[PDB]
Amino acid sequence: DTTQVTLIHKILAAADERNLPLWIGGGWAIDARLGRVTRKHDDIDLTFPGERRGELEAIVEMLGGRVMEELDYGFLAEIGDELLDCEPAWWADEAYEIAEAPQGSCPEAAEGVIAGRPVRCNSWEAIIWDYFYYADEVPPVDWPTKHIESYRLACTSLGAEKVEVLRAAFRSRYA
């Protein structure tokens, strides 16, 4: 969506004004790290400081949107027709961390680009990590192409050995 790209800019601009860091996650995070739009994305994934949820909600409402229901891992919001999938991160020692995610999931540096603009986005490890859950719940043979090819891009970018080490950590933690 041209709509999603512009909505991302609008959200980040509003967050910047509030000195509120926000990380782009999921599909858009992959494209941000690649610096190229590769794929339609169902929604916009956001990671936010859990202790400043109120400020994110205010941004959403400022933009004519609304906060919808709680999710198992965060909350859902909406601007126009577009859905915002929002997950909190919490201050660790010198960075924010998503609960039950790899260390370094919310890097301070803006390490991606969307439509020429630098953006904060979740790490490759954090991105990959969520595919592990997905694989436990949905047989990868039933994954749509949009998710399959994005997963493979992430694996290509991170490297096969690092992915398998991360998978081992995932399996071990949840066994």
Ligand SMILES: NC[C@H]1O[C@H](O[C@H]2[C@H](O)[C@@H](O[C@H]3O[C@H](CO)[C@@H](O)[C@H](N)[C@H]3O)[C@H](N)C[C@@H]2N)[C@H](N)C[C@@H]1O
């Ligand atoms: N960090 C711990 C959590 O990791 C994963 O959640 C991940 C969710 O599955 C992600 O949501 C995605 O998957 C959900 C379905 O689970 C879709 O409804 C949603 N549109 C899609 O973006 C969401 N965008 C990020 C979140 N980390 C696990 N599925 C649940 C776990 O509690």
Ligand SMILES: Nc1ncnc2c1ncn2[C@@H]1O[C@H](COP(=O)(O)O)[C@@H](O)[C@H]1O
């Ligand atoms: N049905 C699902 N169950 C669990 N995880 C999912 C599901 N769909 C997507 N995901 C994960 O969430 C990430 C972000 O999805 P998206 O918001 O569609 O970009 C994907 O890259 C997958 O890792």
